[PDB]
Amino acid sequence: RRKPLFYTINLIIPCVLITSLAILVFYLPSDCGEKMTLCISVLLALTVFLLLISKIVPPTSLDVPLVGKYLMFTMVLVTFSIVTSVCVLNVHHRSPTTHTPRGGGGYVAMVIDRLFLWIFVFVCVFGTIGMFLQPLFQNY
Numbered sequence: 001r002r003k004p005l006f007y008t009i010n011l012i013i014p015c016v017l018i019t020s021l022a023i024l025v026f027y028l029p030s031d032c033g034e035k036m037t038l039c040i041s042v043l044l045a046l047t048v049f050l051l052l053i054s055k056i057v058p059p060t061s062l063d064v065p066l067v068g069k070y071l072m073f074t075m076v077l078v079t080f081s082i083v084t085s086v087c088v089l090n091v092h093h094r095s096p097t098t099h100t101p102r103g104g105g106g107y108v109a110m111v112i113d114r115l116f117l118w119i120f121v122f123v124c125v126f127g128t129i130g131m132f133l134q135p136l137f138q139n140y
Contacts, residue, residue: 005135008063011053012128018045019124026085031092031105039085046078066131077123084120087113 022042025035053067090097092106102108110117 003135004063005132007056008066008135009132011049011056012132015045015049016124016128018042026088027110029105029107039082043078043082046074049074070127070131073127077127080123081120084113084116087116 022038024030025038050071088106088109091100091103091109100108100111
């Protein structure tokens, strides 16, 4: 009943957990040099995630094509999340276009960004449950 499904997800918990904290500075208000450093610092966890998940030391490394093929998709989710910053920065203090009211920081952009962010978050779980569904075929 155990199955590797628990092991594969065991690495997803700490992998996505980083986003929860990143949002505290990204989504929530926190205008400061740390706010940005936090977004870029994430890129470090991505590259490390490869050696970290691979350091698990599998029995027969049967999860080679599973993870290796994921790096291609996960790479698009990490890059898409970074580029999104342009939306907040566009109103924050980098080429102001003026679309929504209020100001002061880059929280105003969150209004319009919420549209894209909606699908973004879906991508995180999409690939999370997608791989978890593989081993959860049925068995009965």
